[PDB]
Design a binder for this molecule. Structure first.
Ligand code: ATP
Ligand code: ZN
Lengths: 435, 149, 49
């Protein structure tokens, strides 16, 4: 309706640096294909790109530009297809339905096995089905519904993500697709092999909730340290068991509740003594001394037993088991610090140039305006797409320079720590005064 | 409390939290990331469910618990999957050693003794050593975040 | 400027609460919260009178 509005919507502006290190502004038309980029991919790119060694995020965005263009093409093709587009648009609904079905199935099996918001409405319907048809038929129906919902969800996921665009090898490489395939196999097993298998689907909770995933990362981030600490504990237990078998064989007497003598010696062989220590002492708060026969002060070896028990308690139990917890706490602190630093950098710096917000205070152009219009990275992506699509014969000066830099795998054309609004006006004023 | 029953006055003790800021901050140490703690508890429940499934499939016999009946002295607590899950989630979590403490003590002569040892060690190292410590680590991290803020 | 008489009715507790409760916005300035609370402060002055 308004020519000016349409022209403004389809026009973009960027800032580039020439080989002479002089800032320049390029105003170009936005290619139509760029209109097909989805918001989820944009958010993922914004919140996933990592700073390189120099501290600039430009390289990752430049690398992902080609994948973004391919995703735009795939999204246009999908929009050409109505039904598949509609199915893709509702991936979250399918995932939620599958999760609720799995949770309800697990609850039913846990409550009744062995046998023989709308969520409250679904619960009432499931209860009515259980009362009418029984546990077995209801579980079968729920499993069939879960399997159907999962196949639909997988189809929608592959359609929306477009991992097939990268290639079949790329799709196999993706871990999420393999996890979904394993989920489908487990659902099939639960439907056919046995009702218990549905319990495995509970693990999907970790995938659904980010907080639980971070809590698990608290352990997985430095799992090697925890495993090495456990190995050190095992070595200490081995040494203690050697000492006990060499000197304290008799005291290792354990009561046994034999199925239809009430005590047995658990240190006849070194392996058995090691097993007994590693199990009871580690699982007992006091240590290995708790299971050991209680010595008497009259016994000549009582001081030796006291020293042995105290050493085991202070070394194996007090320190190493606490060392694992300390490692976990340190990992928690490191993850929190990393997240805080990443958030601060994201919310207080310019993606393209890295200039701090405080540099733009008390100036004509604010930081919000700078990021929104002057140094928008999506404008750079659109310009790259235009340069690739545009014919060489129609290349302008700046466009030719950008194309040459892209071909030469060079990145100096991106402005680094330089904003025209920041210093150009003051420089022009100083130049006028000098003139 | 004035009319219904004298015991209700106990509820008024909670007002202490409102009066003291230090206690309120200590409670915030837990409330700030309560969702993480609840999700960790749910993960622990899922692990207990899997362990109970394994025990009911293979280690049904060992689940014998002594009972002090009001006026047999032992009962099987794994006849049904729900009962076994309840027994695990209660005793193993409330016992420092783990589920192995309540389980009948195996004998080395038994063929399944290595399986029982492996099961007990896995339960102790996974359910007790990590998750229960993960909750405490989350609380400590929340403390540090609040102090820094 | 001259200080309006109504402003003399503001209580110290409200002043301390405003000083120690206002939170920085995205830009990092506390001005917006104070401007928003100015009307409530005037109403509180009237109520205190
Ligand atoms: N160079 C940059 N530095 C920092 N943040 C940026 C940069 N480029 C974009 N952003 C942020 O990324 C998001 C993308 O902004 P964008 O201009 O696409 O907004 P939009 O409201 O979706 O667009 P429009 O209304 O113009 O169609 C916004 O949060 C913007 O602030
Ligand atoms: Zn910038």
């Amino acid at each position: 309706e308004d020519p000016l509005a349409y022209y403004e919507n389809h026009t973009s502006q960027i800032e580039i640096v020439r080989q002479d290190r002089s800032m320049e502004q390029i105003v170009f038309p936005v290619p139509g294909i760029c209109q097909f980029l989805t918001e989820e991919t944009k958010h993922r790119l914004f919140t996933t790109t990592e700073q390189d060694e120099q501290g600039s995020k430009v390289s990752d965005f430049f690398d992902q530009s080609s994948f973004l263009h391919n995703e735009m093409e795939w999204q246009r093709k999908l929009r050409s297809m109505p039904l598949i587009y509609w199915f893709s648009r509702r991936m979250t609904l399918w995932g939620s339905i599958s999760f609720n079905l799995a949770v309800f199935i697990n609850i039913i099996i846990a409550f009744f096995y062995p046998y023989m918001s709308i969520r409250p409405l679904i619960v009432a319907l499931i209860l009515r089905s259980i009362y009418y048809l029984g546990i077995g038929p209801t579980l079968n129906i729920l499993g069939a519904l879960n399997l159907t919902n999962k196949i639909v969800f997988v189809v929608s996921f592959v359609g929306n993500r477009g991992t097939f665009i990268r290639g079949y090898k790329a799709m196999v490489m993706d871990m999420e697709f393999l996890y979904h395939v394993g989920y489908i196999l487990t659902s099939v097993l639960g439907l056919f092999a046995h009702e218990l298998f549905y319990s495995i689907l509970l693990f999907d909770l970790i995938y659904r909730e980010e907080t639980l995933f971070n809590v698990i990362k608290s352990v997985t981030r430095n799992g090697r340290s925890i495993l090495l600490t456990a190995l050190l504990a095992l070595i200490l237990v081995y040494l203690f068991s050697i000492v006990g078998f060499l000197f304290l064989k008799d005291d290792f007497i354990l009561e046994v509740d034999r199925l239809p003598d009430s005590t047995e010696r658990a240190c006849d062989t070194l392996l058995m003594c090691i097993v007994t220590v590693m199990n009871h002492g580690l699982r007992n708060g006091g240590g290995v001394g708790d299971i050991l026969r209680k010595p008497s002060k009259d016994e000549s070896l009582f001081p030796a037993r006291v020293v042995y028990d105290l050493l085991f308690f202070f070394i194996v139990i007090i320190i190493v088991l606490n060392l694992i917890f300390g490692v976990i706490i340190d990992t928690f602190a490191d993850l929190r610090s990393e997240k805080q630093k990443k958030e601060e950098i994201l919310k207080t710096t310019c993606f393209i140039c890295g200039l701090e917000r405080d540099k733009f205070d008390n100036k004509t152009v604010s930081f919000e305006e700078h990021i929104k219009l002057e140094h928008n990275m999506w404008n750079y992506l659109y310009f790259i797409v235009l340069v690739r699509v545009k014919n060489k014969t129609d290349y302008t000066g700046p466009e030719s320079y950008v194309a040459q830099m892209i071909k030469n795998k060079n990145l100096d054309w991106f402005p680094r720590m330089r904003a025209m609004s920041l210093v150009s006006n003051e420089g022009e004023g100083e130049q006028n005064e000098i003139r």
